[PDB]
Ligand binder design. Sequence first.
Ligand SMILES: [Mg+2]
Ligand SMILES: [Mg+2]
Ligand SMILES: [Mg+2]
Ligand SMILES: [Mg+2]
Ligand SMILES: [Mg+2]
Lengths: 230, 125, 196, 196, 195, 195, 222, 212, 204, 233
Amino acid sequence: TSVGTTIVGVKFNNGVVIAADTRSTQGPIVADKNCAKLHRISPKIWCAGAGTAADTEAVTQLIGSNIELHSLYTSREPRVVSALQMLKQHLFKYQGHIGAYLIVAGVDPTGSHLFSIHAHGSTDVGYYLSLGSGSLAAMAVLESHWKQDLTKEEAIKLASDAIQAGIWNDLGSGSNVDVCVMEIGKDAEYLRNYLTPNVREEKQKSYKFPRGTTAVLKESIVNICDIQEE
Amino acid sequence: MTDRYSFSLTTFSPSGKLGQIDYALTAVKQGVTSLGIKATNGVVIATEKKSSSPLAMSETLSKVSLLTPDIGAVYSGMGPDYRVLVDKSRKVAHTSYKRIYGEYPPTKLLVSEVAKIMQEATQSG
Amino acid sequence: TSIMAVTFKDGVILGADSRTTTGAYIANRVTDKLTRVHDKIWCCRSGSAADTQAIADIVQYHLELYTSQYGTPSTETAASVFKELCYENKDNLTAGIIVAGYDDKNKGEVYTIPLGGSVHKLPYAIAGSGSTFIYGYCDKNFRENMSKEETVDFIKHSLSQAIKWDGSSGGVIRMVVLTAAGVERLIFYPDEYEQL
Amino acid sequence: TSIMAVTFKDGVILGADSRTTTGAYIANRVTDKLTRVHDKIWCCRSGSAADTQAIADIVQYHLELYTSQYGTPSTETAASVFKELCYENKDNLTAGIIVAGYDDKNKGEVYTIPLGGSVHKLPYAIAGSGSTFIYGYCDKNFRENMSKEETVDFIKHSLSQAIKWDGSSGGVIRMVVLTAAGVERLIFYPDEYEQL
Amino acid sequence: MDIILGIRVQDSVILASSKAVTRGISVLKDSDDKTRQLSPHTLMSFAGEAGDTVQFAEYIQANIQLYSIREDYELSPQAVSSFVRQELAKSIRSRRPYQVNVLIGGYDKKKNKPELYQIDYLGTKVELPYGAHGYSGFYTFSLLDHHYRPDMTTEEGLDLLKLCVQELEKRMPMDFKGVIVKIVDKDGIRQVDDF
Amino acid sequence: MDIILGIRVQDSVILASSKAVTRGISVLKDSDDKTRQLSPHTLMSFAGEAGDTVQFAEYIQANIQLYSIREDYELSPQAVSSFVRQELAKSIRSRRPYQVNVLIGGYDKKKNKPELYQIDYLGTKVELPYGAHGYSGFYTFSLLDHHYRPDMTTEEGLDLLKLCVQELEKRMPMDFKGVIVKIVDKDGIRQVDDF
Amino acid sequence: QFNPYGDNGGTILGIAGEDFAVLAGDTRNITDYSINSRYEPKVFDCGDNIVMSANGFAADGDALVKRFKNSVKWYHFDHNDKKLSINSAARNIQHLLYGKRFFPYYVHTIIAGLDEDGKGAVYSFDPVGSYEREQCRAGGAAASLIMPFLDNQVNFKNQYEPGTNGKVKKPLKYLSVEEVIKLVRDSFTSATERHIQVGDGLEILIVTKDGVRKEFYELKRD
Amino acid sequence: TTTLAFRFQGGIIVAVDSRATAGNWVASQTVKKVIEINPFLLGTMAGGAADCQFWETWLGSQCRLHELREKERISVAAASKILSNLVYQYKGAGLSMGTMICGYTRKEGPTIYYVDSDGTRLKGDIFCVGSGQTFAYGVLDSNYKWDLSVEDALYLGKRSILAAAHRDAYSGGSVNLYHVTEDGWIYHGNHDVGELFWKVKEEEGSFNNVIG
Amino acid sequence: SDPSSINGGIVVAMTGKDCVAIACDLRLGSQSLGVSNKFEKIFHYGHVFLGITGLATDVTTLNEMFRYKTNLYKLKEERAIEPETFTQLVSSSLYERRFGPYFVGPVVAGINSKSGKPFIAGFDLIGCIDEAKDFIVSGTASDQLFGMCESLYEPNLEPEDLFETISQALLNAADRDALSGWGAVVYIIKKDEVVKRYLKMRQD
Amino acid sequence: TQQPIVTGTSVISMKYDNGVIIAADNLGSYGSLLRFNGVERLIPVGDNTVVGISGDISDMQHIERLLKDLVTENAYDNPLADAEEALEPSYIFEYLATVMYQRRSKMNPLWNAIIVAGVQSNGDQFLRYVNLLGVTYSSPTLATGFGAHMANPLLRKVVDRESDIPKTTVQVAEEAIVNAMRVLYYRDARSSRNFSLAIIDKNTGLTFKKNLQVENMKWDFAKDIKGYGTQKI
Ligand SMILES: [Mg+2]
Ligand SMILES: [Mg+2]
Ligand SMILES: [Mg+2]
Ligand SMILES: [Mg+2]
Ligand SMILES: [Mg+2]
């Protein structure tokens, strides 16, 4: 299991919202400071992934691909329960070896939905969920401020506040907050870098070198063009 | 059981004709007219919705089909053959391209894949 | 997990807590462990959540296909399908399932399928980590042919004690009542059952 | 092993089964697990028989030497001596002891000392492998200030259930009653308690 | 087996390989030739796990001889080395990998150049002026780094090789029973029978 | 260390011990003398774990030299060997045992007889006409069993010893860098400086 | 099984100037993926114009600093209030560390100050007491991120004078205290960006002939 | 690490590299692997850095106590044996030491003892210890003579460390040279391997495999 | 034992104003033993550049595999593959070996021939894409490279300034790694000219 | 070396303008068995200090006796035992920290995590942590076990740095602590509803609250949750 990440999902009046931080790590080292953890399965079905990053990306693309073909075959817009069933049966078959822990949310003709799924293939239903190393920090905020019949504005606020708890308190999480809002009868709105509370301060010094600082042995032009005419 | 027809059903006649292909083209000739026109800023494809009965809801029968978000298809000939080819064309755009390059295939290459499927039904057992 | 199923005069009732843990962390405090495999055949799940969900989904599929061909399956038939999956795949599964159903011919029936994949038809059954603490209580307090209200009280009191002592159990007490009249869901909150 | 001690109006009663096993073999079916460390301070032993016998013998020695110097020790003092031995030698011991005694000033008192060597003063205590199955029953049925006859029934019924479910428990139910009137031994045979 | 050395000079490649074969406690043979001629102007020496070494070498030899007959043409040293690398790279993820390290010394008749390729059992290929496998490089590379020149004659190469073997015979704990030395040049392959 | 041999002939005891010292990868020395003179007519050779060998040998040497001064008398080879055995037998049940095997070659001036004692690190003592430790016996004992006579001269003993060393140099995988040979007789101890 | 050791993260940095020395360290204390404290001082004034930090397992770190401070106190008692010179302190710390050779203080220790000629001094220790006087030394979690930068910007490694193309090295000109502090701040700002255990705050202790001065700077708290 | 010491007509040459590594990470390029025991005795650092540092400065203290008590310079034999007997007491506990104790006295002449943490104590003419020892041995063995001049011997030691520094990944940084005479050791400077390599390559014509 | 650190080596890539730079060391070793100082880790297929660190046999294999695949791509597509597309191909190819992976750390660098936009990307051994705006690092001295890049890098550097920045980032990172060094190469890539420069560095 | 048998879960705490607050539940767990339901894990020392302890209960009872003995010992030959020479929170902590580190150094630890909360003679707030390893640290908010993961994030929203302490009243601080205890009851499988809470204020002294309960719980939303994906009934 790769350690990191804070992701949440929150149900509201007329839809569902998911959110995530933007830090990806390899051990104690930050590989990418502005990672995109909110993945699209279909236009109005989005998921966020924790655990092995390649697995969350790969399993999302595969099911997303099969969901698209299914949608074309049936002449119907994809359902969240289909994505859930296809994800869980794939993950169960690989007995946890595909380290994908996902929060799946979306809207479809049936309504708005929010599920979690765990690498071994178990799934859960809820009004508010959290996954990743910062899930306990996030869940603390959710358990403190969640109520029934939240508005769109209240749900976005709660979701991002839960991610912030992860950002500040969990070492596996950091940088920015990404948000995606899926409302019934509307286009899903992906809000990349919805919050940016971690811009690096200006450095004390410029480290631009004088030209000719580096010692060079040989120079040559590299032929990137194809074999030429004449 | 088992498919015991492992031999070609399309073969060259003494004159060099592939009979089954010619006869397939004859079936296409009997089919309802469809057309395509290319403009500078777009392409149009069109056909007639020849409804078999007025009790039939001809909107439920799609002769013009989306293959990818930027590619569409229309036909003339046997409808059921077209329908299964659209299913195969949609899937092959993903399996042999989108799952590899993370983008939809260019028109010419998807056409190439559909062409290959149709060629194989002309030589396979 | 604390789960049980109890036959009574008018049929059978399934009961369960709502806590799911990952170690000492409660991953879900409002879980639904009472799962429908047919209209009036339900089950209580214990063990691996992934395994028991996978098994239940396969059983639901089997009984749906059975119904399309041969009409409504018996509770025994449902228990047999559960057993077949649990027994044949015992090496790769961690699943303890109680099957409960209502026929009109057979009325309320309960079958328990422990870890090894054996089947045991019983008047009532208890399972899950919390069940250990109520073997004494349940054996002393169970009677055959109880009323609906008595059976609800029996399950409510039993699971109350299981929750009290077992850290892996908790949350709400969910119940599903299976009779000729239909299918009724019940829920009981902490403030109710903790004062019993 | 199934052991318990219960305070009541007139004092305290200790209860125990009589089975001792080596694996699945019953090495002794008529064991006395109720052991005297002073005239009206007794204990119930669970865990390693060698360890608990060694501890009890040392405690009996300590309380005998205490009595010669300072007069009759309190039940708290006896519990403290047990704890000192169990805590300080926790790495090398497997002992779960319930201490029960009667003072005239303090009346009936019960102290339980689990594996780690902590002390817990309680109205009643249960321990041993069989105790797990009667947490529900005992919690539901215990009342403070019961009569002698009620407390005997409570222990008899409780250990009956523990014996029924736990293979490591069985044989006769032994009891020792501690009151101002003195020390009374009771014994109850299988044909009596199995039909409860 | 143990020590295999290679050096590419002006007009030839020289391969030196130990003669000992040891079955744990006893030295069973002291005249073993750890090499196979793949083609008239390409020689391969080898060391690694018992049985696998000869099995691999003869398998490669058979394949190159087959190519030579089919095309009536000798593959370049580079082409042969790439074929050998692929076979070892294929082998490393097999059920039971070939535990074989090789040196390929060849004279390219088209370019009129000697070429030495070092390939380990993983399929790690490098073209070198001089190379070795195992611990051989640890004792010899400091001498080769010092004395080696790209314009050396064959006789100078043999003298530098003697100095390398002398250092091996001094500081190595194992008795490898001397080396068989072979030269690969424009005229083909020949063995130096006094070394 | 590695090979230590002993042979008792008519009028002397001959001990042969290898010269190599190997620190894993490299041979650090090729002139090491694996022996200590315990008294004027008693010599001990040794092999085993590094450090412990020399530490044990020098400890024994110090003790025998102390006895010699205290009593103004040289202990018999038998008496010295018994003392050495006891020290090793004591050591084997210690916290950290001496991992040292020894040969004790002495000339008993009272009986006018050469004597060879073989003692391993457990304290297992045997008096022998010829002996060894480690794998040395496996290669040499068949030759000694064939040629050995109790009435051999010192020169014949050295010749039989040469045949043993030649067989070791042929069939042993390790290069032990030859042997230092010492003779113990009525006149004391001396080293054969050409072998 | 009981593990007597732990890892409290943290990163420290010592630089010796011409007539000054700085010892800096972040103020974040952690276990696994949790923050224990955003401000837990790690660099200490030990008296006699010496500053010290023992980074790694904080319990051992606190124990060592405490015992060294105590050693300074007793050095004054036993040797007529003589000032403990930085070289003498360094040798003393070696013996404190090597005393637990077979159950080591799991820390990387750095001390800073001035030598007996008034020049800047930094000493660096491994867990079991091997030490050396150095010009520049980072310790702890992000040491591998900081040292290469310092090799380049303090010692001008791989930098040559323009026009000569590798023939003439960039001359090693002396840095002021203001210049060193700039490099320290940029080292920790960069480390904060790329290492999860580095952040919250930066505390720098500066040593001169006038005494020990402190400077504090905020670091990112994510 | 690469350390060497060899005896010759003019005394002893001691040469060492300067690199310390923790796994693949280069901890230091400025490590001192020659321990100045006293003005007449030198020891080399290999294995455990602390073990070598600590116990060889301790050895200096024992040597100082010896000459105070006996009013005479300690022999290299006696100095080396104090160290070997000490580490032998700790055998099994996990000390890590591979060192050359080097000195030049009246009674002995130039003397080198290889001392090891498993109790080994070997007198010899040439010793080389560390991860790059095999490379340095090659240059030493092929160029060593007893009748080397002090200048040529110093270069040989420098060149042998350079050989190891080039090929061994865990050796490098700089070369430290010492010359041990009867009147004491003399330091012959710190030589950066980066600058030394190119200098030697050009002047010597060696390392033709490397482009410069 | 650890396959990703048997051979050693590093790769770093950076973006600048209308340009990208990719650089690598030249070492191949067998743990402590240096084996080759000419083992280049950067390859190119048309105008797309690929650096690969890790196990050297897999470095060679993957180069041959992506040459294979980009050659077929070009024949069928009738155009050279673009950096964005190639990145997805590298990701797909690595993930197909999910449970028997190539032990590598690939790095893509190039300029899109149609948009002119500079592009860099990095991968773990199993295909996860890191698409950073600023810089990508890989290899046994990746920690050191992260430290160098984070402090030395600034956006919109001109080609000849970017050369100095990336060169100094590589050099000083390699000199703090035992298994990296033995020479270095830097590619400066513009929309229709690429310059390759071998750097002078210490050889220990 | 041992293993904890009977255990206590989180201890949580924070500073406010005039003092400190500390809280811990009344459960003594025996693995997953919620064995003992009336365990006091906050132990007051004098009228200025409260020591909160998690982990092994047998070791907690041992520490409880050490503190009791410390008060006895301080009173010996000490006329100012209830005035200038009374035990300070800083004295009590340093003593415990010494013991904890010594015990871990003998490879025989007291298997606990401890938070010492109090107010010093000069009115300064004292809050510091120590555990089985002898590791110590201070912070405006401190918590052990689960509390570290779930309580700290909530408490840090009230006091995020040192300058927030004077702006935080006792009512706001207690509210935050009580909410955190509810969150822990929702999410920690080894927690109980019953807890104790102690306030040490420089003006009003030590207020020790027993038999507190988690209240205002949200469970109603559970009735709408059905199945684990597709189930509607
Ligand atoms: Mg029984
Ligand atoms: Mg023997
Ligand atoms: Mg964070
Ligand atoms: Mg000594
Ligand atoms: Mg090197």
